Amino acid sequence: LQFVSPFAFEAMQKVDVVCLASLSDPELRLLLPCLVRMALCAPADQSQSWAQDKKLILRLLSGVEAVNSIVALLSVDFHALEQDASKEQQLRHGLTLEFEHSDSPRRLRLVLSELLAIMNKVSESNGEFFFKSSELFESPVYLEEAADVLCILQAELPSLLPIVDVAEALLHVRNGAWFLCLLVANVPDSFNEVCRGLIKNGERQDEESL
Amino acid sequence: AIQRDAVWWLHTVVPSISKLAPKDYVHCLHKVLFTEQPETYYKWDNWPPESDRNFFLRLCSEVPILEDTLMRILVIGLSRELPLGPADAMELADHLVKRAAAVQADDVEVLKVGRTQLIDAVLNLCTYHHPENIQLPPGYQPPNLAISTLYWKAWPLLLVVAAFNPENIGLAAWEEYPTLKMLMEMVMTNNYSYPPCTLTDEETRTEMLNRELQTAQREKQEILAFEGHLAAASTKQTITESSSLLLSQLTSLDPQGPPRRPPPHILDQVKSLNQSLRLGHLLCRSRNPDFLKQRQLLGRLQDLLLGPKADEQTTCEVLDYFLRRLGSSQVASRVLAMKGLSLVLSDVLQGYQWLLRDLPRLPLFDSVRSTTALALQQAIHMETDPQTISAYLIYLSQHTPVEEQAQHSDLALDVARLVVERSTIMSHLFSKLSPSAASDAVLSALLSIFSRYVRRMRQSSESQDQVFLRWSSGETATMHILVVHAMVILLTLGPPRADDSEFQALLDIWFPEEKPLPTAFLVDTSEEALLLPDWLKLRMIRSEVLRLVDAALQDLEPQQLLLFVQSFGIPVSSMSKLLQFLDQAVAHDPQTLEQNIMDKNYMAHLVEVQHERGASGGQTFHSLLTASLPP
Amino acid sequence: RMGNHDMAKELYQSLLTQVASEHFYFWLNSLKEFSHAEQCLTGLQEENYSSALSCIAESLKFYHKGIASLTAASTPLNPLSFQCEFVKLRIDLLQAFSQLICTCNSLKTSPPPAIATTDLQRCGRISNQMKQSMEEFRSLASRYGDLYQASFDADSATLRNVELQQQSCLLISHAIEALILDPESASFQEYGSTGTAHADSEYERRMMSVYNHVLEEVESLNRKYTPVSYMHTACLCNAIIALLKVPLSFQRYFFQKLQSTSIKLALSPPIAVQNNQQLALKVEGVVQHGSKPGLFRKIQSVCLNVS
């Protein structure tokens, strides 16, 4: 399984766009959700230099066919999703086949529900390490789609999905290191806080246990 | 050297002061075991020192068998009034076994039992003892009830003792409970699952147990019906089958029946430690009693199936049982079935060469050909591994039942569902960064099966969505919509390198050069079917073959053009063609601005980006867009 | 001392293999690495923030090497506590600077639309990140103050240097607050009472000039833009550049310890006390000295806090 290159992460952290243009497509596909968000959503800088950089990012993205899935994900009404997630959390206290056959809002709901379930499991435990078999973070074929939806959910629901709690949650799934790495790659300013949270919550090693 | 225990040392003063109740004595005996980890006592204030607990734990994990237990057993046997239960010893042994797995070693005694009171404990646990508070009527036998804790604790420890040391203790289980042999078979299968891979004998295990269970349940209900009137006369409490307390606290002693499947939650936690322990090695030695060690059953099924003595009935039933698992929603079930099928049966697709080379050589392959084809067709919609789906497609391409129209239509519909619905699988199989030989074989298989299907249909409406096709050359055909969408998707993927005849034939029949398209009409309503929807049209636009692009861009209404330009992944040539058509539409219809174009700035930047890529056209659209607002 | 860190790096590199003791070797190696780290961020362009991030990363690499070496150089009766704390607070406020450079660029990752439909929350992640950066810089200023008031034996110039570092921390914190988090409560204007302050070193002059320029830039940009602005991030990042482009000065207390005053603090005593009878604790202490007692300052009174 392929991780995000240090060269690509350095390019993304500095937002140096000609560097992102000179990148291989498998490496670029890992950074796809964020780059789509910076290319399509309304710019916050509103500066001419950033407008030109946004244009180059759009040019670099135009050749990728996988962008259309992320555009479909970004079209979902996130108000209803946030309301549903909050109500489900208040209520609290094949799955991969359903994810595949699901349209964008339904599959967003599926993976968000699984994430919140893992977060509740983490919060309930005092530190004991569990392993939640999810079948969606485990399937090699669907890792790209699940990762894209995860990045879009973290970006569009930041209050409901704090980055440190996602990081603490992802350790309990099979391929969580890869998911966490590309998640941090898509929000590069979260690296220090993710590392700090991971180290702080690392209180019980149990003599280098699982 | 000691002859007494910690319970006796505590009871020396406890019972002397005042004779405690049996429950209090049992609780004291259970607490006196001291099977907990002493290292956990210094996790709060770091007191007592931990420098010695670590050294003591390693030597404490491996312990010998003392004569104190034997002395206590002898005392209990000689005195009828001695209140000493083996439940505390069983709980201590279970706790020690559970703790020892983390620090287990070859030179460490994982378990050691010094008392032969297992038979006495079993006899005393199944018997009924009159309670102090509850007094039953004289001469009337009360129901057989046991404490939940004792029943739950006696099962795991006894099972572990019987399985780990089946030499002497295993003899008792080898003549009473066949479930011990079934669990040994499961252990030899290296999979703690119900049903196990080694428990494939349905005629002996599943059938007899199912036949006996209905009779046993009926007999139990009949026996309990007489006692229900007397029980209700005293309590006057309602009884319901779904809310029956006795069902979850008592169970009929029926060892001959099928084993109980554990819940998925316990199994998920167990699987994490199952690979860590690696308990499959211990089961290879056990062969007495034999349930039907997995290698022996493997060879037995091999000569029953591969050899000339193979029979239709048993082989067909085994294959049906074995292949209905592939359609399940559990990845573990289908993976185990796949591995077992490869092992029973047995340089490209080496892990799947069994299905391509071993299966056709069977004497009764033709008898079972239809059912395995149906099972694979059902498994296509469930399977997620691209290699497994590749093997299934290749098999369902060489060994294709053609004679029945119904079967061929259903097979085409299933493969079409694979091609259309399973978009991620299709993209993964023919990802453009790596055209593999397996990809070439699968693509050739798909075009071959679809070409034969369309040809056979041509040579000649069960479903509502059937469409009555018409060609410009004079041929008639009735087909589903999904199969047409599927061949269109195959043609977008480009020609194979191994073969081009089938690809070119399909492209010619479906989209002949400079000829009218095969207009499609519904069978029932006889109205013009939308054989090329927007998503499919956009899919063929991104294809690198010019014929699909040309067929897709015909008479495009401007809203569709505006939708297509906004899409991503369009090559430069297709983008230039799209912009040329957009310019023609703008020159012929300036009124596309009002009720189609939601925003001007983003589309202007889009057109600028298309020009920056090196795509011609769009100048009139760019001018019209910049006239509304500056870029 | 004067910030010529390339020359210092060369000379310290030359001085290795001349010492005999391993802790002095680690001390000189740490000095070489600190000089290299400060030399790394001399090549900062005025507006290139990507180059700034790379340079700060290189400086942090060399600083981490240096602090590992310095920790290896610490021994009993030579703990190098001031040096360790000073360079630890230099490692911080540089990775805090790196985080603020990252948050400059975080504005290019767009806000959610759900939050965008209704004032500071509309910014998105960047608002909470600026809040975290403000708290981090305030904590850094507090820690620099703690180092200041734990440096009773330091000469005046070292204390002024620590004051300058603390004031840089406070400057970044105030800029973040007044540009992003609370522009309405920006308080009065930056009316410098000192005006043309009589600086005792060129480092002082450069630090105060940077402070005055940053405060002038902040004041002219107070309510002219919404906190989603690229100009606020531009002003903050330019403040980072200005603060880092003036080379750090290692002062006398980093090398020479002169006063060395302590307290013995013998107190009258695992001691059992009854519940009703409350303890009567007497603490006696003597202030110790090395050679000239009151070289820089004299103890007037001793405050004994019991908890």
UniProtKB/Swiss-Prot annotation, chain A:
Gene name of the record: INTS2
Coiled coil spans: none
Family to which this protein belongs: Belongs to the Integrator subunit 2 family.
Compartment(s) where it occurs, according to its Swiss-Prot or TrEMBL record: Nucleus; Nucleus membrane; Cytoplasm
Subunit structure: Component of the Integrator complex, composed of core subunits INTS1, INTS2, INTS3, INTS4, INTS5, INTS6, INTS7, INTS8, INTS9/RC74, INTS10, INTS11/CPSF3L, INTS12, INTS13, INTS14 and INTS15. The core complex associates with protein phosphatase 2A subunits PPP2CA and PPP2R1A, to form the Integrator-PP2A (INTAC) complex.
Protein name (database record): Integrator complex subunit 2
Function: Component of the integrator complex, a multiprotein complex that terminates RNA polymerase II (Pol II) transcription in the promoter-proximal region of genes.
Shown residues in whole-protein numbering: 15 to 241 of 1204
Curated annotation (Swiss-Prot), chain B:
Subcellular location: Nucleus; Nucleus membrane
Transmembrane residue ranges: 476-496
Domain of life: Eukaryota
Sequence similarity: Belongs to the Integrator subunit 1 family.
Medical condition linked: Neurodevelopmental disorder with cataracts, poor growth, and dysmorphic facies: An autosomal recessive neurodevelopmental disorder characterized by severe global developmental delay with motor impairment, cognitive delays, absent or severely limited speech, dysmorphic features, hypotonia and cataracts.
General function of this protein: Component of the integrator complex, a multiprotein complex that terminates RNA polymerase II (Pol II) transcription in the promoter-proximal region of genes.
Subunit structure: Component of the Integrator complex, composed of core subunits INTS1, INTS2, INTS3, INTS4, INTS5, INTS6, INTS7, INTS8, INTS9/RC74, INTS10, INTS11/CPSF3L, INTS12, INTS13, INTS14 and INTS15. The core complex associates with protein phosphatase 2A subunits PPP2CA and PPP2R1A, to form the Integrator-PP2A (INTAC) complex. Interacts with ESRRB, ESRRB is not a core component of the Integrator complex and this association is a bridge for the interaction with the multiprotein complex Integrator; attracts the transcriptional machinery.
Protein's UniProt name: Integrator complex subunit 1
Lineage: Eukaryota, Metazoa, Chordata, Craniata, Vertebrata
Gene (UniProt): INTS1
Full protein stretch here: 584 to 1314 of 2190
UniProtKB/Swiss-Prot annotation, chain C:
One GO term of the biological process aspect: DNA damage checkpoint signaling
Annotated compartments: Nucleus; Chromosome; Cytoplasm
Predominant localisation class: nucleus
Modified residues (Phosphoserine): S268
Record keywords, A-Z: Chromosome, Cytoplasm, DNA damage, Nucleus, Phosphoprotein
Signal peptide: none
GO terms for cellular component: chromosome; cytoplasm; INTAC complex; integrator complex; nuclear body; nucleoplasm; nucleus
Role played: Component of the integrator complex, a multiprotein complex that terminates RNA polymerase II (Pol II) transcription in the promoter-proximal region of genes.
Membership in a protein family: Belongs to the Integrator subunit 7 family.
Subunit structure comment from the entry: Component of the Integrator complex, composed of core subunits INTS1, INTS2, INTS3, INTS4, INTS5, INTS6, INTS7, INTS8, INTS9/RC74, INTS10, INTS11/CPSF3L, INTS12, INTS13, INTS14 and INTS15. The core complex associates with protein phosphatase 2A subunits PPP2CA and PPP2R1A, to form the Integrator-PP2A (INTAC) complex. Interacts with NABP2.
Name this protein carries in UniProt: Integrator complex subunit 7
Whole sequence portion shown: 535 to 855 of 962
